Motif scaffolding. Sequence first.
Motif, PDB file in Angstrom:
ATOM      1  N   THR A   1       0.823  -1.202   0.000  1.00  0.00           N
ATOM      2  CA  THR A   1       0.000   0.000   0.000  1.00  0.00           C
ATOM      3  C   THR A   1       0.859   1.255   0.000  1.00  0.00           C
ATOM      4  O   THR A   1       2.028   1.228   0.394  1.00  0.00           O
ATOM      5  N   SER A   2       0.271   2.360  -0.459  1.00  0.00           N
ATOM      6  CA  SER A   2       0.957   3.643  -0.536  1.00  0.00           C
ATOM      7  C   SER A   2      -0.032   4.774  -0.298  1.00  0.00           C
ATOM      8  O   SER A   2      -0.675   5.240  -1.244  1.00  0.00           O
ATOM      9  N   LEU A   3      -0.135   5.233   0.952  1.00  0.00           N
ATOM     10  CA  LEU A   3      -0.855   6.466   1.261  1.00  0.00           C
ATOM     11  C   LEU A   3      -0.337   7.064   2.569  1.00  0.00           C
ATOM     12  O   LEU A   3      -1.040   7.028   3.587  1.00  0.00           O
ATOM     13  N   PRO A   4       0.898   7.601   2.600  1.00  0.00           N
ATOM     14  CA  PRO A   4       1.452   8.192   3.818  1.00  0.00           C
ATOM     15  C   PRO A   4       1.460   9.716   3.800  1.00  0.00           C
ATOM     16  O   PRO A   4       2.108  10.311   4.660  1.00  0.00           O
TER      17      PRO A   4
END
Lengths: 46, 4, 45, 95, 95, 226, 226, 226, 226
Positions: B1-4
Amino acid sequence: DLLNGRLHMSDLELVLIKAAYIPDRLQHYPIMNSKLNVLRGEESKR
Amino acid sequence: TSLP
Amino acid sequence: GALNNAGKGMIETNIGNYIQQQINLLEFIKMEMADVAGISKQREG
Amino acid sequence: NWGSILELDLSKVPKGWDVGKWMYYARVNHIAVIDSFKEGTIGASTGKLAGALNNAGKGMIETNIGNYIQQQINLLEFIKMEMADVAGISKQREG
Amino acid sequence: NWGSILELDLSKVPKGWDVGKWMYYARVNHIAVIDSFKEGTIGASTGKLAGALNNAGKGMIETNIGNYIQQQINLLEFIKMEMADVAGISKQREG
Amino acid sequence: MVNNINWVKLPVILDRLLRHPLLTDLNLETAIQYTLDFISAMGLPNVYVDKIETIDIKEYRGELPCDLISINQVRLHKNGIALRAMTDNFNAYPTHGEPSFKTQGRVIFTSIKHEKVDISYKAIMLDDEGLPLIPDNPIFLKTLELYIKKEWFTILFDMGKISPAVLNNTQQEYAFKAGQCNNEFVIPSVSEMEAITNMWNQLIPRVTEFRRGFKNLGDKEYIRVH
Amino acid sequence: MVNNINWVKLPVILDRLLRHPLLTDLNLETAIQYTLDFISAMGLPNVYVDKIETIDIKEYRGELPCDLISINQVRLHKNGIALRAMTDNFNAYPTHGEPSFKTQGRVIFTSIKHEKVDISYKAIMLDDEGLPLIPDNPIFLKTLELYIKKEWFTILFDMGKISPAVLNNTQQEYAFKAGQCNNEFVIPSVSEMEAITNMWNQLIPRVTEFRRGFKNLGDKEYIRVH
Amino acid sequence: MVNNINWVKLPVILDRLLRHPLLTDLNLETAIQYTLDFISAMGLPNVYVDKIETIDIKEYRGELPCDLISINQVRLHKNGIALRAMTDNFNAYPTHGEPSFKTQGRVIFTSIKHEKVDISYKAIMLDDEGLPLIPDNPIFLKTLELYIKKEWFTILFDMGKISPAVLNNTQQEYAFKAGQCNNEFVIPSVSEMEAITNMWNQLIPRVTEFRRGFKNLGDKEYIRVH
Amino acid sequence: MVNNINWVKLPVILDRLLRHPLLTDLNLETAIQYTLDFISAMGLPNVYVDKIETIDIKEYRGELPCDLISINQVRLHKNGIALRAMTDNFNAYPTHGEPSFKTQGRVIFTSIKHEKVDISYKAIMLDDEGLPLIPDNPIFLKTLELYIKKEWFTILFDMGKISPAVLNNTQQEYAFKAGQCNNEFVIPSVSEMEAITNMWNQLIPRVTEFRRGFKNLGDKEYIRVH
């Protein structure tokens, strides 16, 4: 010399040139000449 | 996942 | 859906602003030459 | 009163370039080559770090000291005018 | 009446730099090098802390005292004018 | 860079990696490759050794040193005038200006026939063994550790021997430390900001420090008082 | 490009790929094809060898060198005047100007009947074996490694022998390193920025460096002081 | 910094870490490495010891002290004039200005042949044992504790011996305390704000405190009354 | 601060914590550490004891009191003139202005050779036992209680002996009470607002209260009537 359109770079900084080209030398724009010519002309016409 |  | 929308594109180059800048520079340089020569615009005509 | 100050982040200066020579050529040419694919931008590009690191512009330490200066100058004009009036000596009457 | 006040947060002054010398070079060059990848920004970058900490600009303690001053000056002008009128002595008739 | 590049041998990184039980199959042989990859990918100029070495030009061609990676400058030996990049497409080819150069392999193609040229180039600091020598900066060390851990975990993830969450964490940490390491080595020190300041404020702009070896780039610009 | 193109043989990439247990069926035969594909897809001009070679024009036609891939310039041998692209649709066809050219295969179609023309072209650096020779830049090497890994994993995914997550990671990593490799080889060095600067600042613009071999493109523009 | 750097020995941190049952395999050997990593990653200049030490320059080269990490200034011993960063690419290389310096390893490259130079540098405060000595600031101590806990939990998470939620909490807490610790050591005290104020308000700006050792940076600027 | 700092002994907090059955393994030994951590993390200047103590300077160095944590001011004993922060990098180092100071450990580095200096510093209020003494403000007490509860629950959550919801609630409550406690100790009282008001309204601004011990900072600025 300033009245004759010649600028000495040694008179306004330390020189860290002798080639007559602007990428290292500075243009002179003789903006002082007209002021003195006004006064000499009035001297002549007095 | 990638949402930081 | 952009294929039925999005308007029509433009190859616009802002060359008019460049031309205006050059014209203004020409006016400035001619003015400055006039001043240094001691010959104003009003003194040519 | 000092001018505006820009907060410059050097995370995109290309590889093998000194900051001094990079900025020197930026002065000369008004164009600064940058590198969006530096290793330091990997997190933002791949989505592992906040995307604000490749965006958000450059910040300003701006202080509105000019408005203060204008206010003080206007107050000085007002006080000098009022002193002139009370003394019975107008500006037109000094010159 | 004092000028505007800027709320400056020093969380991005680079490592090994004093605040004094950092600000001194910012004065001289009008450019302040910052470090977006300081350890203190790790939470915001990695998404563990609110992203407002790497954003939101710089705050201002601004008070609108100039408008108050202008109002008082205008009132003074009005009262002096009205005293002049009631006395039967116009401004043009003083000078 | 604020801090100094104190050199230490390569197995300093293996001291730290092997703390992780999942990285115990790593070797000096693997650390060398991934260290060189990290060095190149970061592209930090403070990690290389600055050297100057003169060579001869036989005819528009010269032999280049063995350890050269990148050239800072090339100049003529007798004049000291620097060379620029060669844009000419037929340099030494005749039919029937200022000097410039072009380097591809072990060969430097100049526009001059027979002169000695001085090359200021960057190399890698080596060990008593012919091996790379790394900075001991714990930021650099941690970033190189995280680089190698990320590559090893990427392989193990391609197998399915690591969780995707573990690799995602490793990639996040490596990315942050990579940015931080980039800022550590690049942000100027106080002396480098004095040089940058003396480059920045010129009433009379100086635009010919390439001709010299950028010697006067950070020299202060004095105006006499009148 | 900041760094120098030091050449190394092709199996340097197989040293690094075969570290991955899933890439152990790769070969020199496969590495050659995927290396040539990567070289073309990136289109970096620093990877090719610059050569100049004269040929004869028999009648509006000339034989082209064997190793030619792309032409930098063509010029007349006796004058040195460069040729442009041919826009004419009936070049040597008669019925009942300046010189130009057009190249399709092994043949160059010029607008001139019988002259010698000089062609500055780009080729591939070969090995002692007639094989491609790759840069040893670890950024280039890592990007080529990731390219080959991505293609192999794409095949294995088409079979269903790799997870979709593994391929997604490989594609992400290859994309980032491809961008980084593009920026590595293209961003000018210091000498190339001096050439670009001398091309950029002209009080009197220079607009005829195609006629020459772009020889004077990065020459500084001197104004005499008056 | 508002508070004072009172030094305490390294196992003060192991007193506090070992309160956690999951950190009982930690050691002085591990605490040393992670403490040095934390010290570098924070980059706080109040944690280092300021030292001044004179050296001799043999020929554009000088031997550097053993404990040096970063240089505040270098100046000439006889004049006191500070040196700047060296931008020259051929410093002591001859062919056929003001002084500057450049430091890479144990060697400082100056532009001067034979003079004594004074170096004001930063080192690490050591113990009676040759070990790092840490501030006892409970903010610093808590942040270093959280750093080590975060690294240990990251390893244990790579194994799968900690929940992802536990690591996420640890990372959140470490991030907040890292920011807080950064602000603790950097925000000036009252005396440092008087120095900054005297640097900030100049009717006649002072722009040459690098020449001196920044001695007069916080000196007040007096204007005589007329 | 509106309210007064009435001191009470440390186990007042253990009276209140031990009401929670999950905090019954807490001790005076644990309360001391977490209380000192809370005291530092909040950084409230009303919690410290203000002291003034004279020392001698032998040569640009002086011995510092034992209980010092932070310095309000340093001044010369004979003149009363305050000292500023030292920006000089070579303070007492000779080659071949106003006074300033710099403090790192038990040592204060001044710019003066042999004088007595007065230091106004902050310490911790101690007990008849050599232990910290805490304010009895129930806001401070509740916030310290919540701090210790939050740390204990964080450990127990790292084990998995507390629900994540319980820790989330504890963190929320501690955060709110921390903000409230910050505002309690910092918001000025009525007398402190009279001092701030007399600092704020000056027709003729006063900008030299650092020279004095900020004695006249809150003194009213009287203008004579004309």
